[PDB]
Design an enzyme around this catalytic site. Structure first.
Site, PDB file in Angstrom:
ATOM      1  N   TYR A   1       0.748  -1.247   0.000  1.00 15.29           N
ATOM      2  CA  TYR A   1       0.000   0.000   0.000  1.00 15.29           C
ATOM      3  C   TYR A   1       0.782   1.304   0.000  1.00 15.29           C
ATOM      4  O   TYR A   1       0.365   2.233  -0.673  1.00 15.29           O
ATOM      5  CB  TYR A   1      -1.134  -0.029   1.020  1.00 15.29           C
ATOM      6  CG  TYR A   1      -2.130  -1.017   0.465  1.00 15.29           C
ATOM      7  CD1 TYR A   1      -3.224  -0.544  -0.261  1.00 15.29           C
ATOM      8  CD2 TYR A   1      -1.962  -2.400   0.608  1.00 15.29           C
ATOM      9  CE1 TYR A   1      -4.146  -1.427  -0.829  1.00 15.29           C
ATOM     10  CE2 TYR A   1      -2.885  -3.294   0.058  1.00 15.29           C
ATOM     11  CZ  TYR A   1      -3.979  -2.802  -0.663  1.00 15.29           C
ATOM     12  OH  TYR A   1      -4.905  -3.641  -1.222  1.00 15.29           O
TER      13      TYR A   1
ATOM     14  N   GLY B   1       2.933   4.165  -1.145  1.00 20.78           N
ATOM     15  CA  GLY B   1       3.273   4.527  -2.500  1.00 20.78           C
ATOM     16  C   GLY B   1       1.962   4.567  -3.300  1.00 20.78           C
ATOM     17  O   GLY B   1       0.909   4.104  -2.831  1.00 20.78           O
TER      18      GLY B   1
ATOM     19  N   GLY C   1      -0.775   3.377  -5.416  1.00 19.84           N
ATOM     20  CA  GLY C   1      -1.262   2.062  -5.707  1.00 19.84           C
ATOM     21  C   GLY C   1      -1.438   1.397  -4.358  1.00 19.84           C
ATOM     22  O   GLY C   1      -1.469   2.071  -3.330  1.00 19.84           O
TER      23      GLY C   1
ATOM     24  N   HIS D   1      -5.288   4.523   4.946  1.00 23.08           N
ATOM     25  CA  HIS D   1      -5.192   5.888   4.501  1.00 23.08           C
ATOM     26  C   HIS D   1      -5.670   5.942   3.069  1.00 23.08           C
ATOM     27  O   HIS D   1      -6.410   6.842   2.712  1.00 23.08           O
ATOM     28  CB  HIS D   1      -3.776   6.458   4.740  1.00 23.08           C
ATOM     29  CG  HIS D   1      -3.395   7.757   4.067  1.00 23.08           C
ATOM     30  ND1 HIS D   1      -2.847   7.803   2.769  1.00 23.08           N
ATOM     31  CD2 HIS D   1      -3.472   9.033   4.524  1.00 23.08           C
ATOM     32  CE1 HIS D   1      -2.604   9.085   2.486  1.00 23.08           C
ATOM     33  NE2 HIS D   1      -2.989   9.826   3.509  1.00 23.08           N
ATOM     34  N   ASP D   2      -5.267   4.977   2.253  1.00 23.19           N
ATOM     35  CA  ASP D   2      -5.648   4.909   0.836  1.00 23.19           C
ATOM     36  C   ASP D   2      -7.135   4.797   0.632  1.00 23.19           C
ATOM     37  O   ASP D   2      -7.571   5.179  -0.458  1.00 23.19           O
ATOM     38  CB  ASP D   2      -5.154   3.703   0.030  1.00 23.19           C
ATOM     39  CG  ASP D   2      -3.720   3.696  -0.411  1.00 23.19           C
ATOM     40  OD1 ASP D   2      -3.037   4.696  -0.424  1.00 23.19           O
ATOM     41  OD2 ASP D   2      -3.284   2.506  -0.773  1.00 23.19           O
TER      42      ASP D   2
ATOM     43  N   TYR E   1      -8.590   8.318   1.345  1.00 23.44           N
ATOM     44  CA  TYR E   1      -8.586   9.187   0.194  1.00 23.44           C
ATOM     45  C   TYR E   1      -9.795   8.896  -0.688  1.00 23.44           C
ATOM     46  O   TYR E   1     -10.474   9.815  -1.181  1.00 23.44           O
ATOM     47  CB  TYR E   1      -7.285   9.198  -0.618  1.00 23.44           C
ATOM     48  CG  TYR E   1      -6.218  10.098  -0.035  1.00 23.44           C
ATOM     49  CD1 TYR E   1      -6.337  10.662   1.235  1.00 23.44           C
ATOM     50  CD2 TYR E   1      -5.082  10.394  -0.781  1.00 23.44           C
ATOM     51  CE1 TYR E   1      -5.362  11.489   1.793  1.00 23.44           C
ATOM     52  CE2 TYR E   1      -4.094  11.221  -0.252  1.00 23.44           C
ATOM     53  CZ  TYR E   1      -4.222  11.755   1.031  1.00 23.44           C
ATOM     54  OH  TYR E   1      -3.206  12.552   1.521  1.00 23.44           O
TER      55      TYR E   1
ATOM     56  N   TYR F   1      -4.912  22.036   3.226  1.00 22.61           N
ATOM     57  CA  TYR F   1      -5.821  22.350   4.316  1.00 22.61           C
ATOM     58  C   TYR F   1      -5.069  23.109   5.391  1.00 22.61           C
ATOM     59  O   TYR F   1      -3.934  23.513   5.215  1.00 22.61           O
ATOM     60  CB  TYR F   1      -6.390  21.038   4.945  1.00 22.61           C
ATOM     61  CG  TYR F   1      -5.331  19.949   5.120  1.00 22.61           C
ATOM     62  CD1 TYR F   1      -4.383  20.003   6.144  1.00 22.61           C
ATOM     63  CD2 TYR F   1      -5.236  18.907   4.192  1.00 22.61           C
ATOM     64  CE1 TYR F   1      -3.397  19.017   6.267  1.00 22.61           C
ATOM     65  CE2 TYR F   1      -4.240  17.933   4.265  1.00 22.61           C
ATOM     66  CZ  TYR F   1      -3.331  17.990   5.325  1.00 22.61           C
ATOM     67  OH  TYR F   1      -2.374  17.025   5.428  1.00 22.61           O
TER      68      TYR F   1
ATOM     69  N   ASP G   1      -4.970  12.151   6.785  1.00 21.96           N
ATOM     70  CA  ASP G   1      -3.546  12.376   6.928  1.00 21.96           C
ATOM     71  C   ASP G   1      -3.118  12.271   8.382  1.00 21.96           C
ATOM     72  O   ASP G   1      -2.175  11.571   8.719  1.00 21.96           O
ATOM     73  CB  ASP G   1      -3.120  13.733   6.349  1.00 21.96           C
ATOM     74  CG  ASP G   1      -2.969  13.795   4.869  1.00 21.96           C
ATOM     75  OD1 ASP G   1      -2.646  14.818   4.289  1.00 21.96           O
ATOM     76  OD2 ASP G   1      -3.235  12.652   4.287  1.00 21.96           O
TER      77      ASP G   1
HETATM   78 CA   LIG Z   1      -1.203   3.663  -1.595  1.00 15.52          CA
HETATM   79 CA   LIG Z   2      -7.729  24.363   0.279  1.00 14.30          CA
END
Ligand SMILES: [Ca+2]
Ligand SMILES: [Ca+2]
Ligand SMILES: [Ca+2]
Lengths: 119, 119
Positions: free
Chosen positions: A28, A30, A32, A48-49, A52, A68, A94
């Protein structure tokens, strides 16, 4: 934005070099991620992926390029109470990753794992 | 974001109190404003107002809601080069306006100006 992700990890793990370290780590870490997560770290990447991914369920919310607001209160991280929805969603993804990274051990054996074979 | 504009103003004009100094002065400082600008300061505001209106030409660019990245280098203000396009635009509007209010004279007889007679 990605550039703030890295700064955020440096904020938790000072002796780390983000670009180097968590790039091409496991399946995970990186861009991809496919197959199963080789380890604690790799898990963090995985979640985390997905964060997103969820984040895109917000209109006009592009996680990579959305900046942000956050401060690093000495090892401690804080998301601005003022970010907009998208922003605040992305900072959180994040913030959670960073903290996760700080608690997962790093196995040199996974850096540059062979995706194309192992994932 | 507007909150960052206030912060920008505190950087460029130290000692300042933006919510009360620059708010409700001239025909364009604050609210919305229209008519003929009463002076240099008020003129800065109209440029801001115009800048912001041009902000909205970019899809999903709401200046009041969009948080960008910048820093305040001892009086000096720097807009992050990594800011996305929209963020970059809004960053510049506020930056030009803060410099502008710094080079401008403050006329106290123009504060809380009856915009329905002097504009
Ligand atoms: Ca990833
Ligand atoms: Ca912004
Ligand atoms: Ca105005």
């Amino acid at each position: 934005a990605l550039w703030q992700f890295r700064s955020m990890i440096k904020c938790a793990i000072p002796g780390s070099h983000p670009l180097m370290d968590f790039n091409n780590y496991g399946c995970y870490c990186g861009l991809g991620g496919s197959g199963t997560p080789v380890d604690e770290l790799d898990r963090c990447c995985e979640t985390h992926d997905n964060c997103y991914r969820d984040a895109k369920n917000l209109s006009g919310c592009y996680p990579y390029t959305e900046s942000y607001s956050y401060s690093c209160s000495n090892t401690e991280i804080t998301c601005n109470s003022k970010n907009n929805a998208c922003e605040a969603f992305i900072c959180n993804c994040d913030r959670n990753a960073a903290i996760c990274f700080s608690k997962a051990p790093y196995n040199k054996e996974h850096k540059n794992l062979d995706t194309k074979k192992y994932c």
